[PDB]
Amino acid sequence: SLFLVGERLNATGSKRFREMLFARDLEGILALAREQVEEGAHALDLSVAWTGRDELEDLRWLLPHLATALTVPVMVDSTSPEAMELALKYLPGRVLLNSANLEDGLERFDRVASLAKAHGAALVVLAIDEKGMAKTREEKVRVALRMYERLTEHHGLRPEDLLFDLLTFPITQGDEESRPLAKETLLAMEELRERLPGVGFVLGVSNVSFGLKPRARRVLNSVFLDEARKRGLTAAIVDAGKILPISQIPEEAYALALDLIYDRRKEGFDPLLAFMAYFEAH
Template identity: 50%
Template sequence: MASLPTPSADSRTRIDALREALATRVVVADGAMGTMLQAQDPTLEDFENLEGCNEILNVTRPDIVRSVHQEYFAAGVDLVETNTFGANFSALNEYDVAERNFELSEAGARIAREVADEFSADGRQRWVLGSMGPGTKLPTLGHAPYTVLRDGFQQNAEGLIAGGADALIVETTQDLLQTKAAVLGARRALDAAGSDLPLWVSLAFETTGTMLLGSEIGAALTALEPLGVDMIGLNCSTGPAEMSEHLRYLTRHSRIPLLCMPNAGLPVLTKAGAHFPLGPEGLADAQETFVREYGLSLVGGCCGTTPEHLRQVVERVRDLTPPARDPRPEPGATSLYQTVPFRQDTAYLAIGERTNANGSKKFREAMLDGRWDDCVEMARDQIREGAHMLDLCVDYVGRDGVADMEELAGRFATASTLPIVLDSTELPVLQAGLEKLGGRAVINSVNYEDGDGPESRFAKVTKLAVEHGAALIALTIDEEGQARTVEHKVAIAERLIDDLTGNWGVYESDILIDTLTFTICTGQEESRGDGIATIGAIRELKRRHPDVQTTLGLSNISFGLNPAARVVLNSVFLDECVKAGLD
């Protein structure tokens, strides 16, 4: 990792000013970079014989790059993006120059910084937005390992920070796992630098209405917002006409500010190449409408847009105050494809457990034999039978849990339309699953069995969950063991909620409390009231914390009975728990 400078007072002042501008008015970004560079007809020598690698120009022809930034600032924009869209491992590796990631990123940010400072001399602050493009590999499809891409994005971000960027944008993302790799890489770079630069994400949606791999807008928001990004929105792929419904969804559900940087319409292929038909006035019309209707904080342009496009956008939106939004977040988990709310309208949320090696002999034997297609078919069976999420547990004595989780989570990532509950006692196994899933997972589970200190399992698992934006199942177990009375269950639940929200920044609605139950079928007097205690704890917990979710391994109540009796007891117990508030 490169040695990064401590943020200067000037940098902090710029960042504070950027945040203030975004909170009070519409901030305008620039437009297309690649076509502007190509219009200046750089030579093959300028590209160091790496034709098409625009980032090389940051070193060989900084004058060309500088002139593009100057044209956009002269048009009135507030910030320009660095010429670093392809400064990541996978894109640079196509040219066999991946080792120049930091160098090219730093040079691109430094050029933009110099121009921004020149234009800021008139007393109006201009900013630099560090561009982090998607690269050329889709980790969900196995094109490249997640960790390799994440570390490459970290180098990209380190260079942008060192060069003087005021914010970072992970843009034109096509694969949610790819997006996560970039966000987590950027976050690691920011932490290493002691920097609090804003970190934004911009998604690319196809004319099909989904991202390239089929992710819906709800899935994208559910997966990415918990990563702690500061703004989310759309860019590239389409013109503004195709973005309206996605922006409508975001304005209704996103807690964080919104951005939009469309192409100049859908490209039309001509003899001379791709032509973008939307003129400057059309882009200005669209962005004005988006600001007024959806409360956008940042607007700009992407492919096909020019300084004239942005000049007209500036004129149209510079005096607008974005209307206040009143979003209604919908807590839940998501697969790669679609989001599943924790609160179901007409029933409880059902977590299918037939893909748990400790609970299903059939699944365990298929896993032990390496019959992966059979494992996937068991997951699909549960989808057809109405499960809302799938519990994936590969823990088995003598097995390589990390390898099994990588294999199965990687397959479930594309084969299952349902979110995954990662169920393991081993931290490396949980991490392996998270690094295969582009959607938002739930981790099962945390508790206080060994306390809550920095080396406790609770702290380690929670840290991992927060880093990857996962929700958490939390069990009412403390240093004394599993709680058996209403009072003890609720007390531990209160401790869990206070800890997760106050110390770890987890929303109450992303905590799934399991008040637990023992079997009441031991014949022992001390266990007769366990089921009633569980029901009472659910009722009291929901009274105190209506936003918290409650979950339960229901069939534990009837363990030891014959199958027919279990069905009856489970049914009655479920009905009572749901009436008490079980989600």
């Protein structure tokens, strides 16, 4: 069953965490960590990056305290290799590195992958290369295979140490480009689960619903998570306490969520509006 990675220790993603980080309210941060663990998280995503603030200084402060206080591994969420090195130095045993990609070329990808190999950390890899983010199922497969080959041949990373992130886009804007983006990821995951036995798959599930009302988001996140699980998802970055069991979602909301995820437009039926309409009326 799913390896849940709590999303909330995230300075851009959480006002609560950011204010505590800025005030050096360690006990506040530790309580938020424990909340998420109690609510189901088996690891904690940690993203302190905040524009015009020193990521390395924040991590030098917070990481030693997390190492002694936490019962679960930390997924270090950063694009700075120095920040990843801080995390690897301070944290015990399993760390997960989120993430490596190919946008900056092979050498940056290798630099991050080398860190994972050398310190026995799991590695998240994003479906992003020099041409940008893989949005269609074909693009996602192409990038993932190129990465898989580099990571196994060359770095000697094991399939089970890899978490492929095939990208979660918001399907709430309603433009043509974004409507199929959750489906493309779902279809790619199923295909790659077959092509690449033993690898993990991770998604930042909450991104799918950005812009909807909170109740609508919880439903959509929960349905998207469940659909991804059926396609082979092994880990999820989620607000662990806000994931609904499918059976708790009312019938019409559930059906509309599926219509939105799979872009099941017909004449006179826009799944996005119908989904939004539901939560206006209930």
